[PDB]
Amino acid sequence: PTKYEPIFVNCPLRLRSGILLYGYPGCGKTLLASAVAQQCGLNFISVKGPEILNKFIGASEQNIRELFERAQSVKPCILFFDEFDSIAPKRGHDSTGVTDRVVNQLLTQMDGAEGLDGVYILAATSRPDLIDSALLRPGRLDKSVICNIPTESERLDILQAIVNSKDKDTGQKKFALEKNADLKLIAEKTAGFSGADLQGLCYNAYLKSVHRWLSAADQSEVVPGNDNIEYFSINEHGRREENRLRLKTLLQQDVVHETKTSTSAASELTAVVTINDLLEACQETKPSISTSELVKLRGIYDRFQK
Amino acid sequence: WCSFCYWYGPSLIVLDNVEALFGKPQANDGDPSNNGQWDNASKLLNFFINQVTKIFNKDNKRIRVLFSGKQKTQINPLLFDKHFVSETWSLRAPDKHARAKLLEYFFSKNQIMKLNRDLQFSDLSLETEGFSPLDLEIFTEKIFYDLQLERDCDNVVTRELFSKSLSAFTPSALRGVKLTKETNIKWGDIGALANAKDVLLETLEWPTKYEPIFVNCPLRLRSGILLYGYPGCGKTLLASAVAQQCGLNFISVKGPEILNKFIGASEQNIRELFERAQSVKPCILFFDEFDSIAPKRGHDSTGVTDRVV
Amino acid sequence: MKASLTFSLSGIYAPCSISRDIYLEYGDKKAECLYGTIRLPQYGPGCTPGKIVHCVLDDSLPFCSIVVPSKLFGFMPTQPTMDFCYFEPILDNVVPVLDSVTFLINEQLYSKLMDLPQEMQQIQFLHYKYNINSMETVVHSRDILTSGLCQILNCSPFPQGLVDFTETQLILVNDTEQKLSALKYANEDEEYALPKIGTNSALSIDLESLPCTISRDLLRPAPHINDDNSIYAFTDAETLLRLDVTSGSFITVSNMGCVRLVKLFVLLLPNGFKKRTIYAPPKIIASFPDCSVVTISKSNIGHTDIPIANQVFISRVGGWLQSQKCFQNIILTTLKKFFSESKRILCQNDLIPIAFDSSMADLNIAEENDESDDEDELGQYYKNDSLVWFFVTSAELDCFSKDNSHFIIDPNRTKLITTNITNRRPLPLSRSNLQRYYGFAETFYYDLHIFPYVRQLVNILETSFNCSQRGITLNASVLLHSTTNNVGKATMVRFASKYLGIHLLEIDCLSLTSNSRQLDSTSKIIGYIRAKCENVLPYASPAVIFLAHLDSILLDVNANQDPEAIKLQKSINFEMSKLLDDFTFKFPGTTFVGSVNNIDNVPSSFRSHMRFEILVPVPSEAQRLRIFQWYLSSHELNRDVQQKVPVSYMDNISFSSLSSYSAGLTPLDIKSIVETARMTATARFYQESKKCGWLPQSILITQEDLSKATSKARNEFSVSIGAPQIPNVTWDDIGGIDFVKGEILDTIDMPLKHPELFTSGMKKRSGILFYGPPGTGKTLMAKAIATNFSLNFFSVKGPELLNMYIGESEANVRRVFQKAREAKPCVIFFDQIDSVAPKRGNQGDSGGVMDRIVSQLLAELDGMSTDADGVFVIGATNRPDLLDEALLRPGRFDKLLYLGIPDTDTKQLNILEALTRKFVLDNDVKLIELAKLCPFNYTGADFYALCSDAMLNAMSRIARMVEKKVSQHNELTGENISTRRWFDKIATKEDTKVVVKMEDFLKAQEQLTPSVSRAELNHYEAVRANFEGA
Amino acid sequence: DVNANQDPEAIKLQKSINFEMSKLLDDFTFKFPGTTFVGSVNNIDNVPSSFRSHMRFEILVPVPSEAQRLRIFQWYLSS
Ligand SMILES: Nc1ncnc2c1ncn2[C@@H]1O[C@H](COP(=O)(O)OP(=O)(O)OP(=O)(O)O)[C@@H](O)[C@H]1O
Ligand SMILES: Nc1ncnc2c1ncn2[C@@H]1O[C@H](COP(=O)(O)OP(=O)(O)OP(=O)(O)O)[C@@H](O)[C@H]1O
Ligand SMILES: Nc1ncnc2c1ncn2[C@@H]1O[C@H](COP(=O)(O)OP(=O)(O)OP(=O)(O)O)[C@@H](O)[C@H]1O
Ligand SMILES: Nc1ncnc2c1ncn2[C@@H]1O[C@H](COP(=O)(O)OP(=O)(O)O)[C@@H](O)[C@H]1O
Ligand SMILES: [Mg+2]
Ligand SMILES: [Mg+2]
Ligand SMILES: [Mg+2]
């Protein structure tokens, strides 16, 4: 509606109504689903978790009906299912013992007779093989985009995207990226298993950079010259350094304002990341072995005739 | 009230049965007109708080306020949220030594019954354990009346005429109509064997026989006993007898009650009965049949056994 | 005692003198070096703690006259010597010797002394240079001892006391920074000339309002009581002579308009206020907006120019409390009192402030005046708290004219006449405090540097003012709202009002004379609202209407509606809308400023027509600093209290310590903590008073009980929300966890502290997961976290979540988990997650509720976009294989940290010593011996079992010893005794520490066995070797 | 009794009646010496303990038994 509206003067077929994402990992495309809002300017409304369900038998369908009422009222919005697995498993003889009727209310209103809401159905789920043929159909929700691990240079790509760390038009490399950007070693000396792992690795290396910075900073002054050694030919009691805190807490009383700095790594007091600080955590990068899930994926990919 | 107290100099205001003038309306469940809105009671309270506060910041000595009520939590929590309170003296109970002097005062209160034969009330405490000062008033008057006809002669209290009163008068004002039956086995009624009763006693009485010794050592109070139970016998007697130490507030639970096949069976039972154990003064609590309650699921079985475990 | 004062030429170290007469009224030949005590009269709220002084007897001093060195106080005898003070004789000269003293000295003389290797040479140098002698000398915490040279840096813990090097360490400090060039005591320096300092015909100086009250008993000259009253002025230096007319003269100069005569005095010598200034009471400056440089000249006149103005036609300013029936009577009666009790000159184009206590209120007093003598009351009881302005207005002058400044009202020849009202704008607070002069209820001073929302609202009101002072009327309005209770909503509006010099109405809605009552009187209430508001606006200066708790009256639709409920609702919305919008035309530039408690609860119509929105948060740590800085200030304690003994803090107080430990508390709680500390300190003071004692001069707040009170503040918070309290587990109550404490500080301390340099990156480590065999402290770490850090500690005990009905999750886990977002920064603690979140692939029959919990828990937990509100979730498990892919390293809970069997060699010792904290052992059986005697494979809490049963057998030993001793007693005395009488008649104190000597350890080693065997360890070591799938 | 089911206003009516009854019960013992009071209740639980404390005695009257019934028939069939 924002690029093809001069084309779509009257498309004689109703426009496609939704998208279910799935991934064998934890759905990194949950972030995508959160991002496409600001990336596209539409409003966003979310079915987080199972929250449609209720104690009272009369309430469940009143709840989901009022949900679709809200959506159709907020005419330009994305309607999101946070974990479709929570509520839409395969039909049966009350495999949910009560209130499973919600799945029929959904099937009734996913397109029904109105078809194009102008809203679209968005959803994510790991283990979507518990959903059923009764609900995935091209005349219903269908598009079934797969996500997989970012093999090879896609590790580098996602790493570069995170380490660019640009926001608020300010401190525009908020992570102090390594001056050479020598990522082509680090990214594959690391075995990458997700993206959040790579992000955690980089964050922890930033933390280690702060550690080497923060632990060096004072001692780096102290080594060429100590301070506050208020010796007095101490006698009777060995307070010679135990006095130091009760001294410092009175001996210093300066105040300053509008302080500035420049020798930091392009942001105030920040510590640059460095390739060694990542490489040392190449063994800290921990797998969580589950590749049989790819064989679980091999079901729907066999349902794919291609 | 505020103005008078401000003029009469250093002053104290007493407010009694605060619930009527400042209590929350029964903390009713569900919030119609109660979610984002206040009952008029609070609307009184806040006015009072503001006015006295603008007095209090002028002179810390000028005015103080004393509230008497049922239970610190039950009053309108607004009285806490502005930091109006700062104390919590709770008149928890009478106690052994004082209650005798109190009881003597009631005996000599009016219509003088002129005390009793031989005793001096100390043993006579024996049945009064849970009673309360108004209860000892009523009980004293009852004893006097039911003396004064069962003898044609007047003032002589006798052990048996006293004792027969407590068998049924049961003042028990906090206890409703009736809440006891079991009275079979006394502490000194050692049915079965003492063979390890040594250790049970050593756990039992020492915190009430050597009391301050435990305070000066930062132990967590050592407790916790499993009886070996091999014959399918014993504890039903032994535990009841230990409870008849009477220095305790015994509460009854038995294992095969709790295994409701509804999913939630652990909640609303175990947590309920241990909140009850908090509501009583701390005490022994009974369990049995652990062969049912606690099979070693070992991460193999993981059943509904584990959801109670 | 009263005493006359004089300042000597000063040796500083030289003693004061005690007069023969005081050495007769308190004469004591055993103590000829009578240590006196003096109270120094001063400007300020009250007389600062008095000085103990070492003194020499003098017979030459006149009656009650006493002399002290000048430069000992930095003042010079060139300055006006104060003629009186107050004295106290020290009871039996009882004074403590100081525990510690520290001195600051310049680096040159510092090194010159430290060049001497024999410390006694410096001790003699104290005598040769400074004439110091032990036990004779008393010293004081911070006093500069010579400009550019020696100074005392601290006395501790006492501010004053005796010294002897046999106990006083005499700590020295090097002034490497040369600040002694600036830290010179001399309050006066000789000016290059007295001529050419301006011209005697015309001086110009900034006026300022005197920061304190001043009173007829402190001034040096002797004005009358009935006349000469009220109006005075104060000057700083030889300026007193540059005017040609001395102190005690009148002057009258003003920058504009009419002259204003005032009596001008030199400041008292002990003054802290900045020189090159002319100080005045608010009375004068009220007439002269801005223009702070005032024209000054001799301007003298021959006494009063006008003896009579035969009628006066005064007028009250408009303003909030100036237009109510309940004040009208007290207003007129205090007016009558004020004007009757003294004679004064007054003038047109001038204001008179009047102050009274609004507590007097609905007490009339029947007989004190008009039928009774002129002097009537001790205002000590008839207090003050609130202030009003009357404009002098027209007066009936005689044939004489133009010199209107001398009009005066003879109490029989003249009367005062009401003209209903006038309009005038109050002073800007930025130039002058009223409140701090009159000592009223305080209004905390913000600064726009660090309170963003104040900068916001102040700018809104500033523009609404100045834009309509220019040609452009603004209908500016704003609503304030907050997520918590008790944030200082009203305080902001008030502060802004004073900071900008803007008038306000103050109204609260709760006090309206009816509720949302069923039978319709929304008319009655909104009518009373407008009818109370409108009255002042016909003569209001630029002003705001402030409405407290709009939420009480703007109820909102749908819970269960009566027809009348609908009618009330809509009526209220409509009438309020009309009222507000009408006001915007009824008067220009007049701003509606509301307040509300639940923004969801304000009805939609009002939520649309409202203008600006401001969210005011719970304050930051950076703000907390200034909050403590206020309520711990001198004035902010001294106001509340009667007894003449003042209070202070010790200058040791770590503002960092308070600001960190008070995290999450609201400002109202900070008041509670400080006032509790004040109480506890005063209780200590009166405990001290039980003996003849020491430190009687003043109680101070100290860092210990000020720390302690935080714990009570946190518990009184917790009983409001989140009832569970936690027993204390201090950091040293655990040990042998070095790597784990490392990572925990790397997660909860260093990323939480120092965000001035920690980038506070766009995502954060969410939590901590402890896994391993039971009995390895993995519960204890949580109680420790709850103890030592300021974090609150919400939790659920395993399957506390699951519940009977279907739809379990909203019945608990949602409400609690969002409550942790609702709370200030707080952990959630979990245990037995392997019970709460089964791995979803292990599908369950019977409603599959595990899928419902696990889905809702992940959804509420993870992703955490725009949600880094400190919600650390931390917890423990037995066997992590049963955890769901909730653990899959997204960083949603996956900070795995292991705990296990310790290192063999000394970590068992670190365990034993940690559990030996507050335990007792007092012989040559060092803990090394125990830690070697214990064999290995005993682990963790089993060593606590080893101490537990050792303690049990130790108390058994003591119990059988008691059984012996009580038997041997009963055999000899107290033949019929058992318990209470026995314990109450024994008085043991050597035994009562009941220390184990040994042997209980050896029989513990015999009786105890490892609680998990290696055949049990193997079952955990398997999952250990899974490394959670690596 | 007092219960959640009823208006606190009506409950305060009950309170007033209870209190004034208990006071008048003693007031007879002040104004009119030797007065004695007999109460009757068809179900003991419904009187709150707030009144029951001002008993001096209570009696459970059971239904009669065989020896009583033999006496009672003799009464009704006497001439
Ligand atoms: N291709 C990817 N695969 C997995 N995670 C990714 C990928 N790209 C980014 N991420 C990470 O995803 C995280 C955001 O959480 P997100 O909801 O997207 O995933 P998840 O937690 O694994 O999924 P789920 O919500 O299904 O449990 C970020 O920390 C980001 O680094
Ligand atoms: N920052 C602060 N500085 C000084 N005093 C403060 C501050 N914040 C709060 N207070 C004190 O707390 C009270 C604030 O009252 P205010 O009307 O602003 O809010 P409240 O009554 O706590 O809340 P609400 O109106 O939401 O019920 C006053 O007693 C004030 O002295
Ligand atoms: N520094 C310490 N190191 C190890 N154990 C300690 C330490 N200090 C105390 N303990 C003991 O450890 C106990 C807690 O151990 P832990 O939390 O591992 O076991 P648990 O609470 O019995 O079991 P679970 O962890 O399964 O809930 C404390 O109650 C105390 O007896
Ligand atoms: N002193 C005793 N010695 C042996 N058996 C007893 C004694 N007193 C009671 N019993 C019997 O023991 C049983 C009481 O319960 P208990 O011994 O605890 O068995 P269980 O373990 O099955 O509850 C009853 O059969 C009772 O008659
Ligand atoms: Mg995801
Ligand atoms: Mg308020
Ligand atoms: Mg534990």
Numbering used by the authors:
A (entry chain B): 716 to 1021
B (entry chain D): 510 to 818
C (entry chain C): 1 to 1030
D (entry chain E): 556 to 634
Publication excerpt:
The second cryo-EM structure of substrate-bound Pex1/Pex6_WB shows a dynamic state where both the D1 and D2 rings of Pex1/Pex6 have an asymmetric configuration. One of the Pex6(D1)/Pex1(D1) dimers thereby swings out. This results in an open central D1 channel with a diameter of 20 Å, approximately 5 Å larger than the symmetric D1 ring in the “single-seam” state. Interestingly, the outward Pex6(D1)/Pex1(D1) dimer is stacked on top of a compact characteristic pair of dislocated seam domains of the D2 ring Pex6(D2)(E)/Pex1(D2)(F). We therefore term this conformation as the “twin-seam” state of the complex. In the “twin-seam” state, only four alternating Pex6(D2) and Pex1(D2) domains (Pex6(A), Pex1(B), Pex6(C), Pex1(D)) form the substrate-interacting spiral staircase of pore loops 1. The “twin-seam” dimer Pex6(E)/Pex1(F) is dislocated from the central channel. The lowermost D2 domain of the staircase is thus bound to ADP and the “twin-seam” dimer is released from the staircase. Intriguingly, our analysis suggests that the nucleotide binding pocket (E) between the two “seam” domains remains bound to ATP. Intriguingly, the pore loops 1 of the “twin-seam” in the D2 ring are close together and almost at identical heights, which, at least to our knowledge, has not been observed for canonical ATPases bound to substrate.
